[PDB]
Symmetry: D2
């Protein structure tokens, strides 16, 4: 899998489990189009999305349903969701890991791009 | 100024100056309508393009043009922009400060909401 | 105020109020000597206990009592405190703002240095 | 291994490789005492420190030589190092992962505690 998403909960000090993640690729009309989606596992990971075949260069959007996650915990959140928009540039045979750290009123996201 | 945006550069330890910010409000037809925009000052702050009257409840999107900022500094960043989407004032009027901390392959964003 | 400390609560989306902060300066004998201390205000800021004359170059340590803060809110946090250690003014006098963003199992800290 | 340290570089979008990490445990005299140390691997991880035998409850300090890491890259950093001080509380048979995200003028750290 060329694109991995890892979500952490900065409140409980745990993986963020059962979080819905939708991945989209930018299409000609500059409209978003579904690409991949799933729920994070107990390790907080959303795994084997697409293969290296369909993971072409382009603009991708990763949308993390943070709001539903916090509501499930009884915690009042600020964000409607977390969005990560980036360019996949084809250079070395690279894996992208999108990491997200969640708190009710803040999140951070980091890309780890490895050979 | 019920909506303030503050942007910091985590690489230089400075305010992120001259960063473009666009604010959208979700309209009735579920599309995004332009609400306010500006560039951060020398103190990394974007102030009042918005009044308290005009800043009614709704879903807002703050999009920070992080890519142009890194590129103008000779850096090729991961993300296209930083997006912050939230519901505003739905329990009455609040002041919101959206803080963003920028690195080339990482950003974080935090909301400070005061009465 | 050449040394300012600002602390935010990522759980409540608010300034972190009444947070204890201790600043130490490394002395000649390689131990830490007490330099300044205070509690954050309602705006989450700790201001001037320091003058520009007294804030000479050296290695400084800013220790933020995050544990007492979470516990006073009914929360059992991971960390004992947040520590920030840095060399100050070694190319002439600067203004430093140390920003800390707090969650129970996570914190981040950022330095903004201006001339 | 009951305690893992994972370090990321928010500048290059990579694991932070070859970073020196020193772990200390709080001793009776309220002095720090060496516990474990090593260099992060190419995956940015410092692995199999101690066993569950010697990883008892107590106050631990993880010190990450961020300054040497940035100097090796030609990047001028703010921090002397990053320090993470926490309490290991013995409850479920738990693994602690200490994650650190580094930028020249900022870092964040998160604990992921898992069964």
């Amino acid at each position: 899998c060329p694109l991995m998403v890892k979500v952490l909960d900065a409140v409980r000090g745990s993986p963020a489990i059962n979080v819905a993640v939708h991945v989209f690729r930018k299409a000609a009309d500059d409209t978003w189009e579904p690409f991949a989606s799933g729920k994070t596992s107990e390790s907080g990971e959303l795994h084997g999305h697409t293969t290296e075949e369909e993971f072409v260069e382009g603009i991708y959007k990763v949308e993390i349903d943070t709001k539903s996650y916090w509501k499930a915990l009884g915690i009042s959140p600020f964000h409607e969701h977390a969005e990560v928009v980036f360019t996949a540039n084809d250079s070395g045979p690279r894996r992208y890991t999108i990491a997200a750290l969640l708190s009710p009123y803040s999140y951070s996201t980091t890309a780890v791009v490895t050979n």
